[PDB]
Amino acid sequence: XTXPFXX
Amino acid sequence: XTXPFXX
Amino acid sequence: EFKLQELNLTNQDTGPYGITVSDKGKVWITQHKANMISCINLDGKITEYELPNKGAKVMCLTISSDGEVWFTENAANKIGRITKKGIIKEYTLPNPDSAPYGITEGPNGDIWFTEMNGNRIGRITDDGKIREYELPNKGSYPSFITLGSDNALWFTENQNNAIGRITESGDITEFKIPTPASGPVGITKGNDDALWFVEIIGNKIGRITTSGEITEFKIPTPNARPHAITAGAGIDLWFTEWGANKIGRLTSNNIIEEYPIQIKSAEPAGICFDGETIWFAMECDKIGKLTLI
Amino acid sequence: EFKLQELNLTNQDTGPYGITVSDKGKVWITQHKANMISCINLDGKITEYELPNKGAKVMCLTISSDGEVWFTENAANKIGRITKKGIIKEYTLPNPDSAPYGITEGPNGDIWFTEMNGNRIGRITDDGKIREYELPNKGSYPSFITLGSDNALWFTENQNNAIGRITESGDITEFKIPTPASGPVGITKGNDDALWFVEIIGNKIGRITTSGEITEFKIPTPNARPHAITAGAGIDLWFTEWGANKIGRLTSNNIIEEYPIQIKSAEPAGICFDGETIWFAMECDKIGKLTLI
């Protein structure tokens, strides 16, 4: 949920 | 790189 | 102690993600759903910068030395730029689908950025020439990028469990994080001149010196899932805890305090510091500020 | 035209930054890493002056009328002095850490200097009384300082985008540079009696008269990032181009010529002129001289 999966 | 940032 | 106030945005589409402040208290946010960049004036007024083409997925941004807002377009394979005159320039990358993400200024003024699918550090000049440097290892998934006290650029390698170092001549050097498959994300220069970073998986705040010495400090809340880290006053290091819905602070003696945001499921992302106020972006349509008093 | 010779130092630790010549061809350099001041004798031998305490960050220096080398200690909050008997005197500033930088001689012999964090022009006498004058604007970040034809001291205001003027009575006067946020650095008295200066961001050579009239000349190389400026022969004005790795020269008709160094990434800093040779310090462990052929 932090943009790139999973940042 | 000119001593104080950035002189 | 401190105090937590959340500013609600009027655009509700938008997805606030990367945040930065300027040579006044002007805060700039990237909004990856709205496909635009907004600025909140010192006292009140928002001004949005709608991108020409849709689906760019605006991620990280930074304010350059010559008064420009630089940003990456994760899905458009582009580097963006808002000039002092308010116009938007976009620069397409050499290779298709490089997926630019992190962005910061280099010691000479050049803008450096990371390419996740591209697996290479980037480099761009105002007049818009680009040169890249391939990483040694396959699928390092480079993310955030920061300028260290040794004037080399320091970057986290999400998949490769490392902190990377790149100097001006493209010489790349990697330091393997003791915590296996920790998946580092945020990296920033601390006021002690070491590079501080977060471990989304390991659940740790990481410190790496310019020499390469690594020390780790465990985040009290389990599964906190930290995203972005910024330096505050003195030795302070603030970080957004995306999974725990909290704001973490590494204070004196390397102790971690955690401040609950607790409007629920807010998704804290990018974070910075203007000198008095810790600013952080929450993907769920609001902007958080945190002052001591 | 001209010719470019770089002398390599034997101390490698060192970081040559500020340079000056004497009433012989004696060149003195500040070395901020070595924490010392060296002198290169007319033909051959260096003589180092090691500071008593470590971490002073020796920046600018100048040779006073009575045969003394005066210098600032950026990180030690001090003003230094080498007497003609070779002993080092150090003078602590009234306010903790004030961060002194630029330095030049006043019309009466007094030594004037700028305090960056301090935000005030300084003043020191041989017997070591100090008096300061607070700047009007918050965080002007004053840098270089030079003595103008009107016998007032002229200084650049890096943050405040201005050229400042201070007379003997502490009367301060400021002139806003047309180029927004240009970040001026080097200032010097030109042989036409106007004050000439560099814009590290604007990428321009600036000229201000004593009356206050400003004219600007664009540097041909983009992002040149100029640091220090000195007056040469006739109307010549030489300047170190830190970011472009070149030496710039404003000649006849206000034309800028640019001579490449071509030792890569050398970091040219301080610059001066002994009558025949343009001397300039390169932070990357060498000293550059440039003569007409």
Ligand SMILES: CCN(CC)CCS(=O)(=O)[C@@H]1CCN2C(=O)c3coc(n3)CC(=O)C[C@@H](O)/C=C(C)/C=C/CNC(=O)/C=C/[C@H](C)[C@H](C(C)C)OC(=O)[C@@H]12
């Ligand atoms: C064109 C881009 N510019 C200029 C416009 C910037 C590159 S640079 O100027 O920032 C740079 C950073 C530090 N470098 C040092 O020599 C240095 C950094 O810390 C120190 N020296 C301190 C020391 O005390 C010296 C000692 O430790 C020496 C070390 C660690 C030397 C390391 C090896 N240095 C190099 O090989 C230089 C490598 C690259 C080219 C660096 C940098 C650019 C990062 O060299 C420098 O120009 C400079």
Ligand SMILES: CCN(CC)CCS(=O)(=O)[C@@H]1CCN2C(=O)c3coc(n3)CC(=O)C[C@H](O)/C=C(C)/C=C/CNC(=O)/C=C/[C@@H](C)[C@H](C(C)C)OC(=O)[C@@H]12
């Ligand atoms: C830390 C995250 N966790 C775990 C702790 C929670 C689950 S989630 O947060 O990741 C979730 C996924 C997408 N959500 C959006 O808001 C979202 C997704 O697409 C969009 N918004 C885009 C839109 O704006 C429009 C879209 O067509 C429909 C929307 C936005 C509907 C929004 C209404 N959502 C809710 O009522 C609830 C939103 C939160 C509660 C949701 C949960 C209901 C799953 O989770 C979100 O935070 C997140």
Ligand SMILES: [Mg+2]
């Ligand atoms: Mg999300």
Ligand SMILES: [Mg+2]
């Ligand atoms: Mg330097």
Ligand SMILES: [Mg+2]
């Ligand atoms: Mg720019």
Ligand SMILES: [Mg+2]
């Ligand atoms: Mg004296």
